[PDB]
Amino acid sequence: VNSFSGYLKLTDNVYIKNADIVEEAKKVKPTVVVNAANVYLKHGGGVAGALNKATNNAMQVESDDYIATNGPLKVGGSCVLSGHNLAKHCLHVVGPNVNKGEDIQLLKSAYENFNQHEVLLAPLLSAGIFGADPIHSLRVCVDTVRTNVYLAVFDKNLYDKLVSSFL
Ligand SMILES: O=C(O)Cc1n[nH]c(=O)c2ccccc12
Numbered sequence: 531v532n533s534f535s536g537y538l539k540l541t542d543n544v545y546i547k548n549a550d551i552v553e554e555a556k557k558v559k560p561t562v563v564v565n566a567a568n569v570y571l572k573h574g575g576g577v578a579g580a581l582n583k584a585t586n587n588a589m590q591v592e593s594d595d596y597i598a599t600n601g602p603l604k605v606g607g608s609c610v611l612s613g614h615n616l617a618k619h620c621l622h623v624v625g626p627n628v629n630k631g632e633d634i635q636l637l638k639s640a641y642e643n644f645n646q647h648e649v650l651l652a653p654l655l656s657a658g659i660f661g662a663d664p665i666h667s668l669r670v671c672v673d674t675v676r677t678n679v680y681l682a683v684f685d686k687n688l689y690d691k692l693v694s695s696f697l
Contacts, residue, residue, distance in 0.1 A: 532649060533558050534680045540696055543678050544671060548689035551577060551653050551682040552584045555616035560680075563613055564644070564652035565589075566660065567622035569602040571609075576659045585614040593622070605632050606639030621647060628661030637667065641674035649678045658684070668692050 537545035547554070555563045566577040571593035573582035582589040592611055603609060608623040625640040626632030640655050654671070656662035664683075671679065683689040 532678075533560075534651075537680055538693060540668075541672055543676060544681065545679070546668075546681045546683060546689070546692065548684075548686050549682040550580075550684060551651065552580050552616070554680075554682050555581070555613075555651060556584070558651060559617060560613075560649065560651040561618045562621050562647045562650040563617035563619075564650055564655075565620050565622045566653050566655060566658070567603065567608075567624050568627070569605060569607075569624055571597055571603070571622060577653045581616065581620070584616060588612075588614050589620065606636040608640075608643035617651070621650065623652075623655060625656035625660055625662070625667075628656065629659070634662060634666075637662065637670050638674050641671055644671075644675045644679055645677055647677055649680070651680050651682060653682055653684070664688055664692060665695055668696070 537547045539545055565581050573579050573590050603624050605624050605626050611620050613620045623640050623643050626636040637656050644650055654664045654667040657664040657667045
């Protein structure tokens, strides 16, 4: 048993809810929240800017030190950093950004990072301002992630479409 509430079960291991991931993280304090990161860990908008804003910019300060030491992530890669006031850990995952011309095949590689964590709260990768089709992102998630993932869908309209089109 875990603390996640109100999710619709899609598969053995994937659950979905219409929710603000920031508000959900604050309520649950999950072991792992996933950020929709870029390779520079520049958290300006969408999930990264909303998560970062909720940490009062502490996520950005920590991220800038990580990049100064390690250099940028890979598209499809990840790093584990603090979850600050939102979670124990934040798994920063870089999905391909269609609005930068990145290979959508890298979306599967991105989701494979989730398999290193038994339970995660996460947004759809490469969705929103990263420009991918969220229906596709959900399919890749279901077909790639084997650990228990609780997906927070921001748009109620999109949530309803994801549910109603799910095979
Ligand atoms: O949650 C959603 O409704 C779609 C979605 N998935 N992932 C994102 O990163 C993102 C960012 C902004 C706006 C919507 C998104």
